Each structure stands twice: as C-alpha cells, then as structure tokens.
Design a protein around this ligand. Structure first.
Ligand SMILES: Nc1nc2c(ncn2[C@@H]2O[C@H](COP(=O)(O)OP(=O)(O)O)[C@@H](O)[C@H]2O)c(=O)[nH]1
Length: 262
C-alpha cells in the first residue's frame, strides 16, 4: 500500500511473535519467485497504510543460501522504505553483525530491541539511548511476551524512511578501509544506485562474484578495483574478506562496551 516495511532479524529473535502482534489476521503467505522459500507479508492491524514484508531469519546477508539471497535481492531493490530489524537483546553482539550489514544497504534501519523482559533475570542491562546513538539508528525496547513497545516501534519505523532520511549514517571503520571504499566509490559513479553504493563497494572489495556478474563493469573499472584490493590487502597483510569481518567485529565490540552492563 503506502509505506513498505521490511521485517528481518536472526532466527529465534522473536520475529514471528512480533510479526503476529503487528499484523494480526491481515497476512498473506506465498512464494519468492523461482524458489521454495516462503514469502510472508501483512498489513499493520492498527494502520492499513503500512505493509510488512517479512524476510527469512538470517545471521548474515553474505552467504549464498536461498534465505540470504532472498533478503539481499529484496533489500537491494526499491520495494522497501524502512527496515525493521528485530534484535535479540539477550545476545546483542552477535545480533548486531546482521544489523551492520542492514544499515549498509541505505534503507533506514529501526531496531526493535526484542526480549527486553529476559534481560533482568540474566543480570543484564542495556542503555537503549546510548546504543541508538552509536549505531546512528533509532532503538525501541520491545517484548512479544508482555506485548510492550510494539506500536511504538512500528510508528518509528514508519517515520524513518528513504523519503525522510537525508544522509546515510553507516558504521565507520578503520581509515585504511574507508580510503579503499571511498576509492571504489569514485570508480563506480553511476554504475551503482546512490543509496546502496557503499553496500556495493564493500561487496566488490570482498570480491563478490554475484555482484561482479550483476554489475558488468568495464575494463578500466574492474582494473582499478583490483589494484585498490591488492594494495589494501598488502597494507593490512590479510585478505579482503577478513579485513571487513574484523572491522565489523571491532565496531560492534566498541558499541556493546558503551551500551551493555551487568
Ligand atoms: N520471553 C520472551 N519470549 C519471546 C519474546 N519474543 C519471542 N519470544 C519467544 O521466543 C521463541 C522464538 O520466538 P519467534 O517469534 O519464533 O522467533 P523467530 O525464530 O525469530 O521467528 C518463542 O518461544 C516465543 O514465544 C519476548 O519478547 N520475550
């Protein structure tokens, strides 16, 4: 209908429980084209102008699994206006790995910090506002068990969209990697969508074959990117894939130190 919201998080983060509260009996079950992966969507019960596109639970957008491919293709397309990232608050650091990839898509992320009621019993506290600040995304505490925060997070995701968010606030990595990403961006120009340019730049840096075949870049474009990779790999003395994963982990680690307590 009007605003299209992508619902995604790790498996066992409470996505289904949240999807059900939000949509009630306005659901639609189907098929992602060509594959047997279930496509589920629904209208927001309290606001039929908002549709929710549920996406398969994944730990990462990287793998060449059907589930991750579905998520990648949907989120690199133009259908979604907002990403509503369901996060398991009792397992924050591992959940944020996908989150970082989600922000890089350029579709504005809103986090539903789910399982907020489980924290206390585990002797765990989170500073929602501090977590929100360091990720550059809105964060709203939710619980599908106690049915709290649900309307609040939906409303926030609905007002944090591609049409209302001006500048992309991606996670900032080591200068040396940013220099490489920045240089790949220079080379790319119009060859990639402006919103998801950085996502494409990181993928080409990681030497993603699917993206490489998709983009069909020129001789000169492909050559410069090769030289950027080799020189940066040399600078770090690691392969590209490992540089990126280690930058994500360092960033996420910082963030969890700032926001988590015992
Ligand atoms: N205590 C508590 N349990 C939850 C919450 N959200 C979901 N669950 C439970 O977590 C389990 C997994 O929920 P689910 O919606 O299937 O997560 P999903 O695998 O991402 O779809 C179920 O037993 C839910 O009842 C929550 O906020 N608090």
């Amino acid at each position: 209908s009007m605003t299209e919201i992508a619902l995604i998080g790790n498996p066992n983060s409470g996505k289904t429980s949240l999807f059900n509260l939000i949509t009630g009996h306005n659901q639609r079950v189907g098929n992602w084209p060509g594959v047997t992966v279930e496509r589920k969507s629904g209208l927001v019960k309290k606001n039929k102008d908002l549709e929710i596109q549920d996406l398969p639970g994944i730990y990462s957008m990287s793998p060449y699994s059907p589930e991750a491919k579905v998520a990648r293709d949907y989120l690199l397309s133009q259908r979604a206006d907002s990403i509503l990232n369901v996060v398991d608050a009792t397992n924050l650091e591992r959940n944020l790995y996908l989150t970082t990839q989600l922000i890089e898509t350029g579709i504005p992320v809103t986090i539903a910090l789910n399982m907020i009621d489980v924290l206390d019993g585990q002797g765990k506290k989170i500073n929602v506002d501090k977590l929100s600040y360091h990720l550059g995304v809105p964060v709203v505490a939710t619980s599908a068990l106690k049915q709290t925060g649900v309307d609040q997070v939906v409303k926030k995701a609905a007002h944090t969209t591609t049409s209302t968010v001006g500048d992309l606030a991606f996670p900032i990595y080591d200068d040396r990697l940013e220099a490489a990403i920045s240089q790949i961006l220079e080379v790319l120009g119009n060859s990639v969508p402006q919103r998801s340019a950085r996502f494409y730049a990181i993928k080409l840096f990681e030497q993603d074959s699917l993206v490489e075949a998709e983009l069909d870049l020129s001789q000169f474009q492909r050559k410069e990117i090769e030289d950027i990779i080799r020189i940066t790999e040399e600078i770090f003395t690691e392969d590209a894939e490992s540089i990126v994963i280690n930058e994500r982990y360092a960033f996420i680690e910082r963030v969890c130190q700032m926001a988590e307590s015992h």
